Structures are given as structure tokens and as C-alpha cells.
């Protein structure tokens, strides 16, 4: 009939235009690196639905103490090979095209998300996942965007003591 997720409490990845409405379904395992199922869904356009750890707190920081986010200025050109050039700041491997079925669970640096605390990989910005600044929804007419903060999902664990 219907199914259900595993664990709870996660950073939902939704977009005002992306249409995405998945979530960060992490299911700590016990093998190597990680074995979570962080992949959004409910999309269509070749837009993005989040980004790599590059945000300060999940919708809990305006702009003052180290903005963070991506790098480089606006720069809205993107040319496979132009005289101007472009870089932006790298793009996440999750820009629709497969139902946002992008689950990273193969070879990891140090994703000890099975230590016994969801994701004990709290380093500067644990796991940040901002769902914005990307879209490229070829619509222009309704209410697309192609760059604008609306959703987020940066849940960077916090820990500190003497």
C-alpha cells in the first residue's frame, strides 16, 4: 500500500520552484565511510535541490558572522569555453534528471555518521545543505527564480566544552 522512512528528524530539501520535497533520510550503517540515503525527490526541471556543506546553521543565521555559503561573486555567465570564463563555486551532483535520486554511500573521507549520533561529523559546519542559488528553471513568466534563498537544510551539529 504505502511505505515509510527509517529515521526521523532531518533537513527537508524542498524548493519553491524545484518542486523537490524529499528529505535527508540518513540511516547510519556499519561498513565504511557512510551509508545514508540523502537524496531529494519530487522534481522535474534540471534544477538543484541543496548543496554541499556550505552554510552556517540551518536557517538560523542571517549574514554577519562569516556568511559562508559559496564563493566568488555573482558571475552569472557559465561558459563551457568562453573568453570571459566562469567558475561559480562548483555544483552539487543532484540537479534533477533522475528524480533527485542522488544517494552518496560509496567511499567517504570521514563520515562517521554511525558513531552513535546521527552525524558526529560536526566540523566547522557539520553537514550544510542549502537549497537555493540554483535552479535554471527555463520558465520566466510564472514565478521561477534561478537564484534566491527560500529553502535550507544545513544541520551542522554543534558541540563545545572546556
DSSP secondary structure of 85-120: ---TT---S-SSSSTT-----S--SS--TTSSSS--
Which residues are annotated binding-site positions?
37, 52, 103, 132
Q: Cα(33)–Cα(54) distance, rounded to whole angstroms?
A: 20
Alpha carbons within 13 A on the beta-carbon side of 72: 12
Cell of residue 66, nine digits: 562569516
Method: NMR
CA distance 95 to 130: 13
Of the candidates 112, 117, 122, the one whose C-alpha atom is nearest the C-alpha of residue 161 is: 122
**Residues 6+ away with beta carbon under 8 Å from 142:** none
20: left (phi over 0), alpha (psi -120 to 50) or beta: beta
Q: To 5 degrees, how large is the angle CA 33–CA 131–CA 100? A: 60
Q: What dotted CATH number matches 1-162? A: 2.60.40.200
C-alpha cell at 80: 563551457
Closest CA to 153 of 39, 5, 24, 37: 24
Cα–chain center distance at 52: 5
Q: Annotated binding site for Cu cation: which residue ranges?
A: 52, 132
Query: Which cell goes with 146?
Result: 534561478
38 forms beta bridges with 24
Bind-site residues for Zn(2+) = 37, 103
CA 16/CA 19 separation, integer angstroms = 6
Specify the residue for cell string 545543505: 129
Distance CA 145, CA 11 (A): 22
Q: How many CB atoms lie within 10 A of CB 42?
A: 15
C-alpha angle with apex 57: 53 to 62, nearest 5 degrees?
Answer: 115
Specify whether the CB–CB gap between 149 and 63 falls below 8 A: no
CB 75 within 8 Å of CB 87: yes
Max distance between CA atoms of the chain, in angstroms, equals: 55
Amino acid at each position: 500500500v504505502v511505505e515509510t522512512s527509517a529515521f526521523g528528524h532531518h533537513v527537508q530539501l524542498v524548493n519553491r520552484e524545484g518542486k523537490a520535497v524529499g528529505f535527508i533520510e540518513i540511516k547510519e550503517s556499519d561498513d565504511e565511510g557512510l551509508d545514508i540515503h540523502i537524496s531529494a525527490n519530487s522534481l522535474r526541471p534540471g534544477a538543484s535541490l541543496g548543496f554541499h556543506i556550505y552554510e552556517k546553521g540551518s536557517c538560523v543565521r542571517p549574514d554577519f558572522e562569516s556568511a559562508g555559503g559559496p564563493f566568488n561573486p555573482l558571475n552569472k555567465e557559465h561558459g563551457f569555453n568562453n573568453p570571459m570564463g566562469h567558475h561559480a563555486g562548483d555544483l552539487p551532483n543532484l540537479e534533477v534528471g533522475a528524480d533527485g535520486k542522488v544517494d552518496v554511500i560509496m567511499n567517504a573521507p570521514d563520515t562517521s555518521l554511525k558513531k552513535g549520533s546521527k552525524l558526529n561529523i560536526l566540523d566547522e559546519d557539520g553537514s550544510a545543505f542549502i537549497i537555493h542559488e540554483q535552479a535554471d528553471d527555463y520558465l520566466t513568466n510564472p514565478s521561477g527564480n534561478s537564484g534566491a534563498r527560500i529553502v535550507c537544510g544545513a544541520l551542522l551539529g554543534n558541540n563545545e566544552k572546556q
